[PDB]
Design a protein around this ligand. Structure first.
Ligand SMILES: Nc1ncnc2c1ncn2[C@@H]1O[C@H](COP(=O)(O)OP(=O)(O)O)[C@@H](O)[C@H]1O
Ligand SMILES: [Mg+2]
Ligand SMILES: [Mg+2]
Ligand SMILES: [Mg+2]
Ligand SMILES: [Mg+2]
Ligand SMILES: [Mg+2]
Ligand SMILES: [Mg+2]
Ligand SMILES: [Mg+2]
Lengths: 251, 7, 371, 371, 371, 371, 7, 7, 251, 7
């Protein structure tokens, strides 16, 4: 079970107009059973339908979609997408966040194969300036999932926009997740999670739950440098997205 | 083309 | 206790309560079944979407209009769109109060038969009635005489009425309407260099027609003006993000209403069909009908449509005749507005079709008790 | 004191009060019944219209004349005309004061019996009387001696009176009258290229007959003038705005009174009819009757009819004969004016027939006390 | 030697030589023009099609009848049919033989005048005569007394005859005929569910009428039988292969002849028109006219029309009167057959109008030396 | 005159003189610019390679198709192809004699405007005419009636023609074509195990498509056999020396024509798109178009494609129908063969856009003169 | 015609 | 429809 | 200037399926300024495209190619592919000589660093069956290029299939190459130019023109034993090519 | 009437 967060840049018809760009995207998503698609700029789900036909052309039940309704508190509203194979996991309960430009979304995956039977997934795309404010608020989100859902395993991922002058050492202790031993950050700050040559660990993988800590494969959480793996140029890598995917493996 | 299709 | 009024036409399905001056639930008459199985946030895998949901998620549903040229093709989804109106839009059970449906004239007798059968079985509505869409239009104006020009989405018809008496032999029905303009607008736009083929992207053309298309007072003269002047051009923004420019094709699509030879139909123009309908009437009532012409429907909201029609009839009609084209504001919902007036009237209370009448001799009531 | 006089002529029905010089209830005697369903339920409308109501809306109503050739055919529609004119037009209760009725000579004996019975039972008037319309013309003119030529709409009749005691053996009745003239002009206009088949436009033809047609002194000479000149041509406007022209047909129709062979009728001309009536009289009265000739009826309004009538009589009559025609204005209401003068007369009060006499002897008394 | 006779009118024109037992040249009188721009070089088809040429490719041309309701409406295309008959089909030059034409009675004078002008200038026929289509039916049956009910496509009409001496005052012309009857079928079939709007499919409906429709002996009783049984239902094949089912409407369309109120026309029924024709005549000749009734035209081809006419007249006519409906087989060609016999008659040779006569007195001669 | 006829379509363009039975210039329409500077022995095509040279040296050059879905994209690339066609291959100066061009229907007017200007300026051709590609396919068959489906490399369309009158409202254009199918086969092949990304690999699969793939009469049946038999499997040697095996992909690739859902194309299938074009035609002309269905285009050489189409259409079309899927031999060059016949036609000489006519009215004369 | 009917 | 028109 | 001759056994796309052989072939070519290619089995110029892609992957103008149309008279056809560095030398003009299955080609080169200004290399792949006849005809070719293109020097070298019973002493005298001292062989017959253990000097480098004779560095002409130089096995060496490259350095 | 004329 490969679970990854994909920070596609300005996803929509504009990126879907190029046929070659869609070809690489289709190849990337097939690698991970459960993939998170952030900052979907589409309004009528035209792009999502375009992205799903290539994945479901051989079988109507290869990839199911879980799309968030326009939820941007600010002027622009993006969408969260959850592409998952039904045979690997099954969605049971989803609900909107119940302080953010985009409210986080909570879903349930029934992973029978992995030793963590039930576990939740939280998707978030913080603003470049909100990050300091929202990171303390996410601590209150985890408490809500603990008693409303009675779920031991809770996962948080997305574009937290950490590091790279956004978060400094003065506010590095303001995070309850960093202080608490339950939420151990997986992605090291040294690793680069952006297609740009500059080092930026914008994406952070947060894992919570005693059963979930032994569930993650040791060392599997790492950025997926598709540019070198697929033998593409810097322009092609940037043309796909501005940030590298982050993938964690569940056993 | 100029809108719909790629041409 | 109250009376339910529904204009179950093509394109939009207005609904509301009797006595109101405006419908409360207006939405596109589109029902779509999803192709890819996937549940949104906090949903329960809805089988189908009706109306506003289909428009907002047009990417992943197979949109299909259940009404074609004012004729119901499928009934499995007509039951769905009606069920959405009563419970999800108006938030009122239909079994409490009677309902009043509308239809176009000269529809097949099987269409009205199934409408009555569905109302009494699926919803068990206490009473129902079907009225010609043209007749209800005259009630909004409050007049007694005058032709009704109901040019809706898929059906255009004229029903001349004099002193509350209809003329069934003079009813003319023409299938040229707004929907055929939406399909024709694609071919003319293909000339400029834009492609529109999918039903999802069809609605993009519909927005172009509703906000830009206008009728010219002189086709030949204005064709020359638009061909050598950039003043007629008007930019537009697609939902995708691109920008297009519409030049002379702004007015050619609405011009098909007056010269249906463009669409290949051998039928005469919308101005010619009004003149032909009047000629079928008696000589004495021709003067009254000329002075009172009432427009209706969506496709009569184009700028300058009234002035163009007035010029066309004047050439055909004899001189020294007062030709007044009545184009009141708030005419898109004109058909529904008359439906509210008729329901509230005490005279109509004796012409409702009760379940007692339907049970004794079947659904054939709609042809004798109902007109 | 006050008495009601009513003219029961076909078409135009006049009514008023005794002593007046002009009637006030001047309405056509037509009955209309709609042939269409009432789709609009704004008002209950009516299933019958009499008088000015039917004339204005003649395009939808089916015009029917209850009186044909001065003979009542449909008594049910005749009652509606009588009922309407008493209340709606004159606002007078019939029972309060007596009424008078007028009728043509040589009427069927069954017509008189039922007309009297309706007065006594349906309206219960205290007393009425029926008089020959020809006789009442003499009173209007003031003279008591002469020959009366009543050429009305349905029946043309001629009665010679010499100082009273009108000769019954010298009375002539001709069915060629205004009703047949209008129908003949309907066929002639077909030659020019206009069609007036249905009864709704049978009224515009009559209006044309009362406005444009005129009588020419020389029928043969005008054919050369009409067929070789456009001076005789005149224009006319239909209610719908069309323009029609009347050429030789302007004087062709009104001449038919003198040559009934155009309509296939074996009867002689009206001039011969008047001449034959005088011939049956004795020589001692023929000289007097020639001098005092009075023309009455609607069909006398044609210009030149007086000069035309004396010309044929002069040719038929021997030389040194005083051929004089008296055609004063307002002769259209000559029958009504005489009735008003006769009713206001105190001497006429005695030979009224009362209700008690009718009950004692039955309706047959109308042929004994009344003539 | 042999003189050409042509019963040219609405529908299918017929032509042939005098003395022939059947018209050889029978073809619809339809003139059409293309409504699309040509695309094939070397295709070579002309811009004007007449007769069977237009019928074969009727899915492209716009069919326009030059003759409507017995009166020619357009003379440009009418000359084409006249030109096509003599040259392309008959292959005989008309300049060598006399030409006999037929027309309906009670028609505009301008129709006859322009007909004579063309036949003496464009084609230079040595001699012409025009005969009433009603009187020619007598020679077809070889009789001298009897009303004829000539039910043409454009106009039906009835002329009483009695050992010659046609009565001009008893001729009634009714605009209800086969062509207007066809327009009723389209509106009726719309109720079932089949739509025929454009004139290309107008021929298709006409073919349906002459193969399935029939007249019942009792319209009311037949309504109940067909509304509760499928026996009256008969299938038919469309040109495109579609199978359409005809229900109770099979007899409703012919019934419009007896009840014009179905069509909204105010005039009386066909049987009432025939009954009214005899009533206008003298009683001395009514007995013989009742026993001799000759049918004619194409619309009297419906099965059972003989029984229905006899039944309707029997109720109107007094009892114990011999009413015989003479409907000989192949009466569709009766009008043309009578013309062939008349031309061969030696006596008729003196009634021809020579070109010298036309030149001397102008085209107006046709009103004097011809009936 | 020896006027040249050039196809210049997507994929491989054809050229030749008028009157020839087969083109003399056949080569792919590929022009590419070197990705390396390197110079051959005495070579002067450093800027680009056009024609069969690019195909022979695909390993070095960068192949780019100037024509995309019948649309010219790089006007600088188009001039390279045309200059090579006239001089390097046809060995003829274009200035001597006029040329004819073929373009797909429903194309942007800017495509024709620039293309007209280029030849009258760069090549100074005395005259030119532009013809629809689909229309010219009928001349090769030598008929006048029947629909044409020109399933070309970059566009598939159906243009019904009846008696030389093309119907402008029934042309349907479909973007799925042969080049699109090549991409689909690559996607399946990568899943199979063999990867093709470089444009050099794009040509190899195209050769595989032209050689091994075939249309299956029943798509479902082959899955049962393919999964249980290796007889369907065929081995094609790659240029590198490796022998790959094609299994069920032999028939899956051509099946995208009938099921556009494989590539996500929401449009109807090729069998369905030929039904919709007929369904928009008249009822009377529907019979002829069913009989004649001319097949054309290079994507129609698959084995059994005609047999598959007849099976699909006959089931969808009404039974008792004669559906002949005409497949003339060597239909790959039908478009050019038809052009040769039209060029030699004498009547075609009168519709040529002369150079003088271009100067007076500017480059806008194409819309007025050409179809 | 010229007034009444359409012709 | 059922014959003429497409519906 | 460094010029080497390499005779790769059946240069084609199939050998490029292997990656290790393509690695050494890149290492070999990069060691010389100008190198000629023999048994080029490529028919659509695809193998040369792959080879030059490796050469010019970083700098677009590291190596420039000159190739020839298939000149094989028999079923097997070959191309005289020329690879050179633009900075070190520049190609002026090309020529193809009007008796051989694979007729030779002449290309002009302008050298600035070396004493020689212009020189032309003639590449030949003589048929093993008739190796005697072809070389005699090149004597006239040397005469042809002397005045028609005015080069003082006429470089002529390639796979002449010399020695090891192909040419004997009696036929060696019959060869015009040994008759005239203007063109003098460089590779000794004792030395081995084949990757196999047998000692044959199939490749033959002969120098014409006095100016190049001084420009030729003495002792520079020697076979390149890439098997021993790269520390590869005989099977690996034979996999790359059955012959040994020969080279000469010019000052 | 009752015989001659229509009335
Ligand atoms: N001014 C007129 N000129 C010619 N005809 C007239 C005129 N007025 C009336 N008539 C005709 O004379 C007929 C008789 O009119 P009138 O005397 O009012 O009726 P009645 O004869 O029943 O008394 C009417 O049918 C009408 O058509
Ligand atoms: Mg971004
Ligand atoms: Mg509507
Ligand atoms: Mg009177
Ligand atoms: Mg006829
Ligand atoms: Mg093509
Ligand atoms: Mg070797
Ligand atoms: Mg040796």
């Amino acid at each position: 079970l490969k679970i990854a967060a994909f920070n596609i840049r300005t996803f929509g018809e504009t990126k879907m107009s190029n046929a070659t760009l869609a070809s690489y995207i289709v190849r990337i998503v097939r690698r991970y059973d459960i993939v998170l698609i952030q900052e979907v700029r589409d309004s009528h789900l035209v792009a999502v339908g375009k992205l799903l036909d290539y994945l479901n052309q051989d079988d109507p039940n290869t990839y199911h979609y879980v799309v968030s309704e326009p939820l941007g508190r600010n002027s622009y509203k993006e969408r969260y997408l959850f592409l998952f194979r039904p045979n690997k996991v099954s969605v049971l309960d989803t609900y909107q966040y119940d302080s953010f430009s985009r409210e986080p979304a909570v879903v349930k995956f029934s992973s029978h194969s992995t030793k963590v039977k039930e576990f939740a997934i939280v998707a978030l795309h913080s603003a470049p300036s909100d990050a300091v404010a929202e990171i303390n608020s996410l601590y209150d989100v985890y408490l809500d999932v603990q008693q409303k859902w009675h779920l031991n395993d809770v996962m948080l991922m997305g574009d937290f926009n950490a590091d790279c002058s956004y978060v400094t050492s003065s506010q590095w202790s303001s995070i309850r997740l960093r202080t608490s031993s339950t939420f151990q950050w997986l992605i090291p700050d040294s690793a680069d999670t952006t297609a740009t040559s500059t080092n930026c660990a914008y994406d952070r993988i947060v894992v919570a739950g005693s059963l979930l800590q032994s569930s993650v494969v040791p060392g599997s959480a790492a950025p997926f440098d598709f540019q070198a793996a697929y033998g593409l140029s810097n322009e092609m890598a940037l043309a796909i997205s501005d940030h590298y995917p982050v993938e964690v493996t569940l056993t | 083309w100029x809108a719909x299709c790629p041409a | 206790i109250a009376a339910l009024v529904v204009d179950n036409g093509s394109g939009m399905c207005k609904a509301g309560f009797a006595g109101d001056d405006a419908p409360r639930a207006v939405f596109p008459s589109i029902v779509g079944r999803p192709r890819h199985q996937g549940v949104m946030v906090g949903m329960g895998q809805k089988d189908s979407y009706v109306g506003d949901e289909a428009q907002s998620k047009r990417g992943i549903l197979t949109l299909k209009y259940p009404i074609e040229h004012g004729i119901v093709t499928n009934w499995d989804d007509m039951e769905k769109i009606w069920h959405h109106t009563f419970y999800n839009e108006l938030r009122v059970a239909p079994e409490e109060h009677p309902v009043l449906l509308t239809e176009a004239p000269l529809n097949p007798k099987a269409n009205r038969e199934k409408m009555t059968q569905i109302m009494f079985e699926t919803f068990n509505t206490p009473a129902m009635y079907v009225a010609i869409q043209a007749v209800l239009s005259l009630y909004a104006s409050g007049r007694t005489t005058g032709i009704v020009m109901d040019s809706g989405d898929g059906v255009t018809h004229t029903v001349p009425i004099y002193e509350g008496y209809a003329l069934p032999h003079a009813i003319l029905r023409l299938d040229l309407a707004g929907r055929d303009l939406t399909d024709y607008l694609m071919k003319i736009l293909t000339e400029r260099g834009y492609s529109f083929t999918t039903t999802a992207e069809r609605e993009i053309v519909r927005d172009i027609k509703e906000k830009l298309c206008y009728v010219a007072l002189d086709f030949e003269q204005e064709m020359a003006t638009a061909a050598s002047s950039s003043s007629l051009e008007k930019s537009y923004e697609l939902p995708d993000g691109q920008v297009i420019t519409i030049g002379n094709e702004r007015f050619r699509c609405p011009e098909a209403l007056f010269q249906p030879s463009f669409l290949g139909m051998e039928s005469c123009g919308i101005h010619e069909t009004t003149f032909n309908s009047i000629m079928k009437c008696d000589v004495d009532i021709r003067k009254d009908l000329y002075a009172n012409t009432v427009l209706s429907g969506g496709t009569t909201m184009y700028p300058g449509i009234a002035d163009r029609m007035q010029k066309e009839i004047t050439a055909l009609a004899p001189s020294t005749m007062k030709i007044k084209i009545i184009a009141p504001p708030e005419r898109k919902y004109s058909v529904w507005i008359g439906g509210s007036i008729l329901a509230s009237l005490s005279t109509f209370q004796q012409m409702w079709i009760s379940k007692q009448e339907y049970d004794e001799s079947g659904p054939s009531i709609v042809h004798r008790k109902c007109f």
